[PDB]
Structure 1
Amino acid sequence: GWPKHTACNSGGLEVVYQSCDPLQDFGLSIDQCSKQIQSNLNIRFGIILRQDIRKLFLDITLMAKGSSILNYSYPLCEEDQPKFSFCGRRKGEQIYYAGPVNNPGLDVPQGEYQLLLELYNENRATVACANATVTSS
Protein backbone atom coordinates (compact mmCIF):
# COMPACT_ATOMS: atom_id res chain seq x y z
CA GLY A 1 0.00 0.00 0.00
CA TRP A 2 2.32 2.67 -1.38
CA PRO A 3 2.02 6.09 0.25
CA LYS A 4 0.04 8.97 -1.27
CA HIS A 5 2.16 11.48 -3.18
CA THR A 6 1.37 14.97 -4.40
CA ALA A 7 1.82 15.23 -8.15
CA CYS A 8 1.00 18.93 -7.84
CA ASN A 9 -0.90 21.39 -5.68
CA SER A 10 -1.12 24.96 -6.97
CA GLY A 11 -3.52 27.49 -8.45
CA GLY A 12 -6.64 25.71 -7.19
CA LEU A 13 -5.74 22.23 -8.51
CA GLU A 14 -4.47 19.42 -6.29
CA VAL A 15 -3.50 16.04 -7.76
CA VAL A 16 -2.58 13.23 -5.34
CA TYR A 17 -1.80 9.68 -6.50
CA GLN A 18 -1.01 6.28 -5.07
CA SER A 19 0.74 3.48 -7.02
CA CYS A 20 -1.54 0.44 -7.43
CA ASP A 21 1.25 -1.85 -8.71
CA PRO A 22 1.90 -4.24 -5.79
CA LEU A 23 5.57 -4.47 -6.89
CA GLN A 24 6.54 -0.83 -6.57
CA ASP A 25 5.98 2.89 -6.17
CA PHE A 26 6.96 5.46 -8.80
CA GLY A 27 7.50 9.20 -9.17
CA LEU A 28 5.13 11.56 -10.93
CA SER A 29 4.93 15.34 -10.73
CA ILE A 30 3.06 17.84 -12.86
CA ASP A 31 4.46 21.29 -13.71
CA GLN A 32 2.34 24.49 -13.55
CA CYS A 33 -0.86 22.99 -12.18
CA SER A 34 -3.89 25.21 -11.93
CA LYS A 35 -7.68 24.97 -12.00
CA GLN A 36 -7.31 26.00 -15.64
CA ILE A 37 -5.17 23.19 -17.02
CA GLN A 38 -3.04 24.30 -19.99
CA SER A 39 -2.94 22.13 -23.11
CA ASN A 40 0.17 19.90 -23.21
CA LEU A 41 0.96 19.73 -19.50
CA ASN A 42 4.55 19.10 -18.63
CA ILE A 43 5.18 16.14 -16.35
CA ARG A 44 8.15 14.43 -14.70
CA PHE A 45 7.79 10.63 -14.48
CA GLY A 46 10.33 8.25 -12.93
CA ILE A 47 9.98 4.45 -12.81
CA ILE A 48 11.96 1.19 -12.86
CA LEU A 49 10.46 -1.06 -15.51
CA ARG A 50 9.30 -4.45 -14.26
CA GLN A 51 8.09 -5.60 -17.68
CA ASP A 52 9.56 -5.40 -21.19
CA ILE A 53 7.80 -2.94 -23.49
CA ARG A 54 7.22 -3.55 -27.21
CA LYS A 55 3.90 -1.68 -27.27
CA LEU A 56 2.51 0.58 -24.57
CA PHE A 57 -1.08 1.65 -23.88
CA LEU A 58 -2.63 4.12 -21.44
CA ASP A 59 -6.16 3.70 -20.04
CA ILE A 60 -7.77 6.42 -17.95
CA THR A 61 -10.94 6.10 -15.86
CA LEU A 62 -12.51 9.33 -14.63
CA MET A 63 -15.25 9.29 -11.97
CA ALA A 64 -16.94 11.76 -9.61
CA LYS A 65 -19.48 11.34 -6.79
CA GLY A 66 -19.51 7.56 -7.40
CA SER A 67 -20.45 7.88 -11.08
CA SER A 68 -18.56 7.35 -14.34
CA ILE A 69 -17.62 10.45 -16.31
CA LEU A 70 -15.36 8.97 -19.02
CA ASN A 71 -13.22 5.98 -20.04
CA TYR A 72 -10.21 6.52 -22.26
CA SER A 73 -7.79 4.12 -24.00
CA TYR A 74 -4.89 5.12 -26.22
CA PRO A 75 -1.79 3.49 -27.76
CA LEU A 76 1.30 5.44 -26.74
CA CYS A 77 3.89 3.66 -28.85
CA GLU A 78 4.99 0.60 -30.76
CA GLU A 79 8.73 -0.13 -31.04
CA ASP A 80 10.31 3.00 -32.58
CA GLN A 81 6.93 4.61 -33.41
CA PRO A 82 7.60 7.27 -32.27
CA LYS A 83 11.37 6.75 -31.93
CA PHE A 84 11.51 8.95 -28.81
CA SER A 85 9.33 6.69 -26.59
CA PHE A 86 9.42 4.00 -23.88
CA CYS A 87 8.87 1.26 -26.45
CA GLY A 88 11.89 -1.02 -26.78
CA ARG A 89 12.73 -0.50 -23.12
CA ARG A 90 13.40 -3.63 -21.04
CA LYS A 91 12.92 -5.00 -17.50
CA GLY A 92 15.20 -3.33 -14.97
CA GLU A 93 15.82 -0.13 -16.93
CA GLN A 94 15.34 2.99 -14.82
CA ILE A 95 13.46 5.61 -16.86
CA TYR A 96 13.08 9.33 -16.28
CA TYR A 97 10.73 11.21 -18.61
CA ALA A 98 10.41 15.00 -18.43
CA GLY A 99 8.08 16.25 -21.12
CA PRO A 100 4.57 17.09 -22.32
CA VAL A 101 1.49 14.92 -22.38
CA ASN A 102 -0.84 15.80 -25.23
CA ASN A 103 -3.93 16.94 -23.32
CA PRO A 104 -6.46 19.59 -24.36
CA GLY A 105 -6.74 22.65 -22.11
CA LEU A 106 -9.51 22.24 -19.56
CA ASP A 107 -11.05 24.56 -16.99
CA VAL A 108 -11.69 22.03 -14.26
CA PRO A 109 -15.04 22.65 -12.54
CA GLN A 110 -14.83 22.96 -8.76
CA GLY A 111 -15.13 19.59 -7.04
CA GLU A 112 -13.41 16.26 -6.40
CA TYR A 113 -12.68 13.64 -9.07
CA GLN A 114 -11.22 10.17 -8.98
CA LEU A 115 -8.85 9.08 -11.71
CA LEU A 116 -7.38 5.66 -12.45
CA LEU A 117 -4.39 5.57 -14.81
CA GLU A 118 -3.21 2.20 -16.15
CA LEU A 119 -0.07 1.84 -18.30
CA TYR A 120 0.34 -1.61 -19.86
CA ASN A 121 2.20 -3.49 -22.57
CA GLU A 122 1.44 -5.73 -25.57
CA ASN A 123 0.78 -8.67 -23.21
CA ARG A 124 -1.70 -6.70 -21.09
CA ALA A 125 0.89 -6.62 -18.32
CA THR A 126 0.75 -3.68 -15.94
CA VAL A 127 3.77 -1.38 -16.29
CA ALA A 128 2.33 1.30 -13.97
CA CYS A 129 -0.96 1.82 -12.13
CA ALA A 130 -2.05 4.87 -10.17
CA ASN A 131 -5.24 5.84 -8.52
CA ALA A 132 -5.54 9.53 -8.03
CA THR A 133 -7.73 12.19 -6.55
CA VAL A 134 -8.10 15.57 -8.27
CA THR A 135 -9.46 18.51 -6.30
CA SER A 136 -10.45 21.73 -8.03
CA SER A 137 -11.10 24.54 -5.57
Structure 2
Amino acid sequence: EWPTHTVCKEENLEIYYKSCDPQQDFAFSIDRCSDVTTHTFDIRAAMVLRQSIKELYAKVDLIINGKTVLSYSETLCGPGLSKLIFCGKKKGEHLYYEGPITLGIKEIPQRDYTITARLTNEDRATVACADFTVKNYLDY
Protein backbone atom coordinates (compact mmCIF):
# COMPACT_ATOMS: atom_id res chain seq x y z
CA GLU A 1 0.00 0.00 0.00
CA TRP A 2 2.99 2.46 -0.33
CA PRO A 3 2.52 4.81 -3.32
CA THR A 4 4.38 4.10 -6.57
CA HIS A 5 6.82 6.92 -7.34
CA THR A 6 7.83 8.05 -10.86
CA VAL A 7 11.63 8.40 -11.18
CA CYS A 8 11.48 8.63 -15.01
CA LYS A 9 8.86 8.93 -17.69
CA GLU A 10 10.53 9.84 -21.02
CA GLU A 11 9.77 8.79 -24.57
CA ASN A 12 11.54 5.45 -24.46
CA LEU A 13 12.22 5.24 -20.72
CA GLU A 14 10.04 4.68 -17.70
CA ILE A 15 11.33 3.97 -14.19
CA TYR A 16 9.05 3.59 -11.14
CA TYR A 17 9.70 2.40 -7.62
CA LYS A 18 7.60 1.28 -4.66
CA SER A 19 9.02 0.68 -1.13
CA CYS A 20 8.54 -2.97 -0.10
CA ASP A 21 9.64 -2.06 3.44
CA PRO A 22 6.28 -1.95 5.32
CA GLN A 23 7.75 0.41 7.90
CA GLN A 24 8.37 3.35 5.53
CA ASP A 25 8.58 5.00 2.14
CA PHE A 26 11.80 6.63 0.95
CA ALA A 27 12.73 9.35 -1.55
CA PHE A 28 14.71 8.59 -4.71
CA SER A 29 15.51 10.47 -7.91
CA ILE A 30 17.92 10.36 -10.87
CA ASP A 31 19.40 13.67 -12.03
CA ARG A 32 19.48 12.58 -15.67
CA CYS A 33 17.29 9.61 -16.57
CA SER A 34 19.11 8.60 -19.70
CA ASP A 35 22.36 8.09 -17.74
CA VAL A 36 20.94 4.76 -16.60
CA THR A 37 22.14 3.45 -19.98
CA THR A 38 25.71 4.29 -19.17
CA HIS A 39 27.98 2.77 -16.56
CA THR A 40 27.31 5.62 -14.05
CA PHE A 41 24.35 7.84 -13.11
CA ASP A 42 23.87 10.38 -10.29
CA ILE A 43 21.16 9.80 -7.72
CA ARG A 44 19.48 11.50 -4.75
CA ALA A 45 17.98 9.42 -1.99
CA ALA A 46 16.60 10.14 1.49
CA MET A 47 15.12 7.90 4.19
CA VAL A 48 14.88 7.39 7.92
CA LEU A 49 17.02 4.52 9.22
CA ARG A 50 14.84 2.34 11.44
CA GLN A 51 17.85 0.04 11.96
CA SER A 52 21.56 0.70 12.50
CA ILE A 53 23.90 0.36 9.53
CA LYS A 54 27.06 -0.75 11.30
CA GLU A 55 26.82 -3.39 8.60
CA LEU A 56 24.93 -3.06 5.29
CA TYR A 57 24.28 -5.64 2.55
CA ALA A 58 22.42 -5.09 -0.73
CA LYS A 59 20.58 -7.95 -2.36
CA VAL A 60 19.56 -7.14 -5.95
CA ASP A 61 17.19 -9.45 -7.85
CA LEU A 62 16.14 -8.96 -11.52
CA ILE A 63 12.74 -10.38 -12.48
CA ILE A 64 11.70 -10.80 -16.12
CA ASN A 65 8.32 -12.25 -17.21
CA GLY A 66 7.60 -13.01 -13.47
CA LYS A 67 10.80 -15.13 -13.13
CA THR A 68 13.84 -14.21 -11.01
CA VAL A 69 16.58 -14.60 -13.58
CA LEU A 70 19.47 -12.95 -11.64
CA SER A 71 20.38 -12.58 -8.00
CA TYR A 72 23.30 -10.50 -6.75
CA SER A 73 24.66 -9.74 -3.27
CA GLU A 74 27.12 -7.02 -2.21
CA THR A 75 28.45 -5.83 1.17
CA LEU A 76 28.22 -2.02 1.37
CA CYS A 77 29.33 -1.63 5.03
CA GLY A 78 31.31 -3.94 7.16
CA PRO A 79 34.71 -4.58 8.73
CA GLY A 80 37.21 -3.69 6.00
CA LEU A 81 34.52 -3.55 3.29
CA SER A 82 32.90 -0.14 3.66
CA LYS A 83 31.66 1.71 0.54
CA LEU A 84 29.49 4.61 1.78
CA ILE A 85 30.56 7.53 3.92
CA PHE A 86 27.28 7.12 5.87
CA CYS A 87 28.14 3.61 7.03
CA GLY A 88 28.08 3.64 10.84
CA LYS A 89 24.84 5.67 11.09
CA LYS A 90 22.92 4.65 14.18
CA LYS A 91 19.21 3.79 14.43
CA GLY A 92 16.96 6.81 13.85
CA GLU A 93 19.27 8.87 11.64
CA HIS A 94 18.02 10.55 8.51
CA LEU A 95 20.18 9.03 5.73
CA TYR A 96 20.99 11.15 2.68
CA TYR A 97 22.85 10.32 -0.47
CA GLU A 98 23.53 12.30 -3.58
CA GLY A 99 26.16 10.81 -5.75
CA PRO A 100 26.73 8.28 -8.53
CA ILE A 101 25.78 4.74 -8.73
CA THR A 102 28.78 3.33 -10.58
CA LEU A 103 28.60 -0.03 -12.28
CA GLY A 104 30.77 -2.99 -13.30
CA ILE A 105 27.83 -3.55 -15.68
CA LYS A 106 28.18 -0.96 -18.55
CA GLU A 107 24.40 -0.32 -18.53
CA ILE A 108 21.23 -1.58 -16.85
CA PRO A 109 19.31 -4.13 -18.95
CA GLN A 110 17.02 -3.25 -21.87
CA ARG A 111 13.18 -3.49 -22.11
CA ASP A 112 10.70 -4.48 -19.39
CA TYR A 113 11.68 -5.85 -16.01
CA THR A 114 11.56 -5.40 -12.21
CA ILE A 115 14.59 -4.93 -9.95
CA THR A 116 14.00 -5.75 -6.29
CA ALA A 117 16.75 -4.04 -4.22
CA ARG A 118 16.75 -5.00 -0.58
CA LEU A 119 19.18 -3.50 1.94
CA THR A 120 19.68 -5.39 5.28
CA ASN A 121 22.05 -4.94 8.28
CA GLU A 122 24.25 -6.73 10.88
CA ASP A 123 21.14 -8.51 12.14
CA ARG A 124 19.57 -9.34 8.74
CA ALA A 125 16.89 -6.71 9.50
CA THR A 126 15.43 -4.84 6.53
CA VAL A 127 16.78 -1.28 6.31
CA ALA A 128 15.22 -0.49 2.87
CA CYS A 129 13.57 -2.45 0.08
CA ALA A 130 12.47 -1.16 -3.39
CA ASP A 131 10.65 -2.86 -6.33
CA PHE A 132 11.84 -0.78 -9.31
CA THR A 133 9.81 -1.12 -12.57
CA VAL A 134 11.93 -0.59 -15.62
CA LYS A 135 10.88 -0.04 -19.22
CA ASN A 136 14.10 0.80 -21.08
CA TYR A 137 13.99 1.27 -24.87
CA LEU A 138 16.64 4.01 -24.96
CA ASP A 139 19.63 2.09 -26.42
CA TYR A 140 17.07 1.66 -29.18
Range into which the TM-score falls when normalised by the shorter chain: 0.7 to 0.9
What per-residue deviation string (whole Å, max 9, x for no partner) do you get for residues 61-101 of structure 1? 10111222211100012268547523210111112100011
* Structure 1: gaps spanning 5 or more residues: none
Contact 2:77 2:84 in 1 (8 A): no
Structure 2 gaps of 5+ residues are none
Instruction: Give the CA RMSD over aligned residues.
Output: 2.1
Residue of structure 1 equivalent to 2:107:
106
Give the 4+ runs in structure 1 shifted more than 6 A: none
1:134 aligns with 2:108: no
User: Which residue of 1 is the match for residue 118 of structure 2?
Assistant: 118
- Higher mean C-alpha displacement, 65-74 vs 75-84: 75-84
CA contact (8 A) 1:80 1:87 kept: no
TM norm structure 2: 0.86
The alpha carbon displacement at 1:37 in A equals 1.1
| Distance verdict in 2 for CA 1:121–1:130, change over 3 Å | same
Where do 1:1-137 residues align within 5 Å?
Answer: 1-10=1-10, 12-34=12-34, 37-78=37-78, 82=82, 84-103=84-103, 104-106=105-107, 108-109=109-110, 111-137=111-137
- 1:36 shift after superposition: 6.2
**Take 1:80 and 1:29, find their aligned partners in 2: how far apart are those partners?**
29
Does the 8 Å contact 1:61/1:117 carry over to 2? yes
2:76 and 2:84 in contact (8 A); partners too: no
Q: C-alpha separation between the residues in 2 aligned to 1:63 and 1:81?
A: 28
Aligned amino acid, residue 29 of structure 1: S
Identity of aligned residues (%): 43
Give the secondary structure class of the aligned counterpart of 1:106.
Answer: coil
Q: How many residues align?
A: 136
Alpha-carbon offset, residue 15 of structure 1? 1.1
User: Contact 1:48–1:95 at 8 Å: present in 2 too?
Assistant: yes
What residue identity is the alignment partner of 1:65? N
Q: Which one has a larger percent strand, Structure 1 or Structure 2?
A: 1
